[PDB]
Design a protein around this nucleic acid. Structure first.
Ligand SMILES: Nc1ncnc2c1ncn2[C@H]1C[C@H](O)[C@@H](COP(=O)(O)OP(=O)(O)OP(=O)(O)O)O1
Ligand SMILES: Cc1cn([C@H]2CC[C@@H](COP(=O)(O)O)O2)c(=O)[nH]c1=O
Ligand SMILES: [Mg+2]
Length: 1011
DNA sequence: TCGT
DNA sequence: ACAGTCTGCGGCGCGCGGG
DNA sequence: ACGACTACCCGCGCGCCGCAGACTGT
């Protein structure tokens, strides 16, 4: 009765019959039986060498439930037609855009609202432009308020100017620009357009908008890349332009052009630099200071110049767009990319005003209260020290105070006149003078990060007072007899020059000299020096008695350093968010659901924050936002870590979300498995697909149990090993995870693990350099081989790479690792775009009340009404199985494993936090938050309201109109270069685990090709 | 960019 | 009205922490 | 000079070196 599981030759379970019918339709293989037998023999040899043949795997009853039908014979056609469907009007508006520009009025009128100027006709007053495509710019007086002051727009036929009532007689600075974005489909082009979108009146709606704001900076970063490799390549750029500024004549063609061509193919983010690069345009920037004033009357004069400045910026932005925009179509030609960009260009953050203000006060008060007391106490200690000038015996006798300079400043006295030499602290020690920077300073300014802090607070390392040496930082003296014993402790000997300086200065003080100076260990490396001792990395040294201090303040100070540090980094930006309340604008905050359905309270407090998001701010086309993509998670000790819990949902709504599992490891394993055309052909893939996270049998969890470490540290250790990190750094990582270990044990574990993982290396003439004998050698060779292609393209979609990192622009400097990492990191972005496109299609088709709320990398959250919540969760589970199979079919495999098909957990909550069961108690927050719900596939399928409902007939008919063009996968194009016998002999050499066998195979191959 |  | 002689300011690099 | 490196973003605080600017001294 029950269906029998389906298993491939390896012990891996495939999907059930129904899902196989609905996702892959009808397909067949077995094209090369003999070659498949050979590849199976090699895979069996490797698996038996690594000892995974016959091991039990997880078997589960097949899942079967109905799915929405596809719109094509294959997945590529379906995704092409959906991607063409999601942006029909916008792309057609982006093309046919005007090139000629109309003239500008000789004079401008100061009138409140929107004024339209047409050449040859009188100016008119309009409510709002009624134009499909405009170029737009905003200017605001940031010192006075956050609301805008004036705005300028250009179209194909006319000019438009918007003026605020504040500069027209009124005294209320609160006003937003109206553009009617809820009714008319339109495209607004700008540079850093996220700043402008926050100043539009009709973007503060829960109901979805019909406008698309496009940014040129993302188009510049994506193609014609900034060359931001975060490498000396970025630094060598400013030095070259500094040299060009120095000498007017620049004969760079002799050396700089030859070794580094890439210096002439890119520029910076800024509009002046981008314009200068693409076009010969110079943009003077001297009138921005006028907007830094605190008087509105200065705005009233010079009005014509400011409006002409804004118009010049608009014209420059338009000409920059006209150059950059066609290139992005060449680099990124698949329709899904543009739709995903449009989907990520819209985000909204609901919140409450009074709670935000209370959180902002409670996060600053404790920080200032903690800081003030400790600074006052250390000032008091300095004052107590600074009266020992008269008596020489105590500052000479004391070991710690001898280090400080005690020389009195020279005094210059003029005869019959005042000295007037700007003398600071006459008759005072040098260090106390160095405390005061200027004559005006009456009170010393000191921080726990000061260098003199280990001199003020006396500190002993192994019962030895710390000494300062200019070359070796902090050192501790060791007696002559016990030196060999310290050699057992692996303490390094300090530089001989520092030894001579120490003995010379001591002989100047007296008592001759005894012992030898040993450097304090530094966590990053043995050779690296140490400059601070109150950091986090020394905290365990404070316990166990290795580092000791008589004062109890030091034990306080480290905790203070723990408590406020993140706030010290983030206090400004959090206090600079633009929050708009409901009371000021009472005709704007409309509900997502068309039916009001009551849900109105007794004047409740709702507010909205529009994030400033650059969609492609990275050379791997990832999003960059300064504040909400860097927010910390909640912790018991840290102050202000409850930031993401301020986002809340209005009454009658909730949040539904999910996170991807092992995203970059599953993609890396699939690339390796594509040679054998079977899931599990490599050992790393078999280990990755053995278990599931819900049972606790995932690879990251297994790594942690072997190393005795948490799961996050295991993830760091694995992702460091996949990219190029040596065993020496892995040993230091193991020392960092467990401090109470010796170096030799860590070296043995790291060397053994690296020998079992990577294997050995062989250099040959015909085959350049390769790895062999390891469980992951195939992946390491494959990543390099794809990274040395002349034209590198993303496998799933086909996006290109920036001109800065191409091989033809590189001759001496290589910049190799980023080229390897780039393919996988871009594939993650393609994965996110595919899920966003599928979700948009399903929400439009089945008429759900939902919109995208936030999207951190690999995480998506949606705002959903109470009625349809489980349906929204269902809309997630359909999407992922669509995306993952899309990954498999492009690489040749027409099968998908059952265990990896669905999300492990789907979250339903009222606020944003990592886990639904977290109390989220911080020093600033003393109230627990009620828990939410998490679900899996079976529990979701047991709910009665999960089913979607009846579809709409119009959507399919609209989708069917578009066209589909067949394309060839990129890896099939890569395979054409290699002759077939090369692949067979090369893979046979890779599977061997001995030098003699590899040499014999090379001899056989050379004899065969020779004759 | 630095090691040997 | 020229020629030494100190005494602050300003920019830059590097550690150090969050994702 | 041939090999050897975790990758991508965002910011703050402190010490060091290169110059303007006033004071004598003729
Ligand atoms: N230290 C790192 N070095 C390199 N890549 C990293 C590092 N940390 C994270 N990544 C990558 C791997 C993922 O694609 C992404 C972060 O996703 P994340 O959720 O942290 O991990 P994951 O998806 O592999 O595991 P999980 O099962 O916990 O979701 O960025
Ligand atoms: C810590 C860390 C984060 N990210 C990105 C991906 C996940 C997102 C949130 O990460 P989690 O919420 O902490 O930030 C990286 O790309 N590399 C890293 O090392
Ligand atoms: Mg994940």
């Amino acid at each position: 009765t029950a269906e029998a599981p389906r298993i491939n030759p390896v012990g891996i379970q495939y999907l059930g019959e129904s899902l196989q019918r609905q996702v892959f339709g009808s397909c067949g293989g077995k094209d090369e039986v003999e070659q498949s037998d050979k590849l199976m023999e090699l895979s069996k040899k490797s698996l038996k060498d690594h000892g995974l043949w016959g091991k039990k795997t997880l078997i589960t009853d097949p899942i079967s439930f109905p799915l929405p039908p596809l719109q094509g014979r294959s997945l590529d056609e379906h995704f092409q037609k959906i991607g063409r469907f999601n942006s029909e009007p916008y792309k057609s508006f982006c093309e046919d855009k005007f090139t000629e520009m109309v003239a500008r009025p000789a004079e401008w009128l100061r009138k409140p609202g929107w004024v339209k100027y047409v050449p040859g006709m009188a100016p008119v007053e309009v409510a709002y432009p009624d134009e499909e495509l405009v170029v737009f710019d905003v200017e605001t007086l940031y010192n006075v308020s956050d609301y805008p002051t004036l705005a300028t727009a250009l179209s194909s036929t006319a000019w438009y100017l918007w003026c605020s009532p504040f500069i027209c007689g009124g005294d209320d600075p609160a006003a937003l620009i109206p553009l009617n974005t809820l009714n008319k489909e339109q495209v607004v082009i700008g540079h850093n357009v996220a700043y402008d979108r926050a100043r539009v009146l009709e973007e503060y709606n829960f109901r979805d908008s019909k406008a698309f704001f496009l940014d040129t900076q993302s188009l510049h970063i994506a193609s014609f890349g900034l060359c931001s490799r975060q490498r000396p390549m970025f630094m060598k750029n400013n030095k070259k332009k500094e040299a060009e500024v120095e000498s007017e004549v620049h004969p760079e063609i002799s050396i700089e052009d030859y070794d580094d061509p890439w210096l002439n193919v890119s520029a910076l983010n800024s509009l002046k630099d981008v314009a200068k690069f693409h076009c010969k345009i110079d943009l003077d920037k001297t009138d921005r200071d006028f907007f830094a004033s605190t008087d509105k009357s200065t705005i009233i004069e010079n009005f014509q110049k400011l409006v002409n400045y804004c118009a010049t910026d608009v014209t420059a932005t338009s000409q920059v767009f006209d150059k950059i925009f066609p290139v992005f179509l060449k680099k990124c030609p698949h329709p899904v990319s543009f739709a995903g960009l449009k989907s990520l260009s819209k985000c909204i953050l609901p919140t409450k005003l009074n709670d935000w203000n209370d959180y902002l006060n409670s996060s600053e008060s404790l920080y200032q209260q903690s800081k003030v007391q400790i600074e006052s106490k250390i000032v008091q200690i300095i004052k107590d020290i600074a009266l020992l000038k008269d008596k020489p015996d105590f500052y000479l006798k004391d070991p710690w105070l001898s280090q400080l300079d005690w020389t009195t400043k020279p005094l210059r006295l003029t005869k019959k006149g005042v000295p007037a030499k700007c003398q600071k602290l006459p008759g005072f020690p040098e260090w106390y003078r160095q405390l005061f920077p200027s004559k005006d300073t009456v009170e010393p300014k000191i921080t726990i990060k000061s260098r003199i802090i280990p001199i003020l607070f006396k500190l002993s390392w192994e019962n030895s007072p710390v000494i300062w040496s200019k070359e070796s930082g902090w050192c501790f003296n060791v007696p002559h007899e016990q030196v060999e014993t310290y050699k057992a402790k692996n303490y390094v000997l300090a530089d001989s020059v520092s030894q001579e300086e120490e003995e010379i200065r001591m002989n100047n003080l007296g008592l001759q000299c005894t012992g030898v100076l040993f450097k304090v260990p530094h966590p990053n490396g043995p050779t690296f020096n140490c400059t601070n001792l109150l950091t986090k990395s020394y905290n365990h040294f404070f316990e166990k008695g290795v580092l000791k201090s008589e004062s109890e303040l030091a034990h306080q100070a480290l905790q203070i350093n723990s408590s406020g540090s993140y706030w010290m980094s983030a206090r400004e930006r959090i206090q600079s968010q633009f929050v708009v309340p409901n009371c000021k604008f009472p005709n704007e905050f409309q509900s997502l659901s068309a039916k009001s359905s009551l849900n109105n309270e007794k004047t409740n407090d709702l507010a909205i924050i529009i994030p400033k998001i650059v969609p492609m701010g990275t050379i791997t086309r990832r999003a960059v936002e300064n504040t909400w993509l860097t927010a910390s998670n909640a912790k018991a000790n840290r102050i202000g870590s409850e930031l993401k819990t301020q986002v809340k949902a209005p009454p009658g709504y909730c949040f539904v979300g999910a996170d991807v599992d092992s995203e970059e490891l599953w993609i890396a394993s699939l690339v390796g498995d594509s040679i054998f055309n079977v899931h599990g052909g490599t050992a790393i893939g078999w280990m990755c697909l053995e278990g599931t996270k819900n049972e606790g049998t995932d690879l990251h969890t297994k790594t942690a149990q072997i190393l005795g470490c948490s799961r996050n540290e295991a993830k760091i250790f694995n992702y460091g090993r996949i990219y190029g990190a040596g065993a020496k750094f892995a040993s230091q990582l193991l020392k960092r995870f467990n401090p109470s270990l010796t170096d030799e044990e860590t070296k043995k574990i790291a060397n053994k693990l690296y020998e079992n993982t990577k294997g050995k290396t062989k250099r040959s003439k015909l085959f350049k350099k390769f790895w062999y004998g390891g469980s992951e050698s195939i992946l390491f060779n494959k990543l390099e081989s794809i990274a040395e292609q002349e034209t590198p393209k993303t496998p799933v979609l086909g996006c290109g790479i920036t001109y800065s990192l191409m091989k033809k622009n590189l001759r001496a400097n290589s910049f190799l690792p980023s080229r390897i990492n780039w393919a996988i990191q871009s594939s993650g972005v393609d994965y996110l775009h595919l899920l966003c496109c599928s979700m948009e299609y399903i929400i439009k088709k089945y008429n759900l009340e939902a919109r995208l709320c936030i999207s951190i990398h690999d995480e998506i959250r949606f705002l959903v009404s109470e009625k349809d919540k489980y349906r929204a969760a269902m809309a997630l589970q359909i999407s992922n199985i669509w995306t993952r199979a899309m990954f498999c079919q492009q690489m040749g495999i027409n099968e998908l494993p059952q265990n990896c098909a669905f999300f492990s957990q789907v979250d339903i909550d009222s606020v944003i936090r990592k886990e639904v069961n977290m109390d989220c108690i911080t020093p600033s927050n003393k109230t627990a938050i009620p828990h939410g719900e998490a679900l899996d596939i079976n529990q979701l399928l047991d709910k009665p309201n999960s089913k979607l409902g009846k579809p709409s007939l119009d959507i399919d008919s609209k989708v069917s109109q578009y066209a589909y063009n067949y394309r060839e996968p990129v890896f099939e194009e890569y395979n054409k270069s290699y002759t077939p016998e090369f692949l067979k002999y090369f893979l046979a050499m890779q599977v061997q685990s001995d030098k003699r066998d590899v040499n014999r195979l090379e001899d056989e191959y050379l004899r065969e090709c020779t004759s």
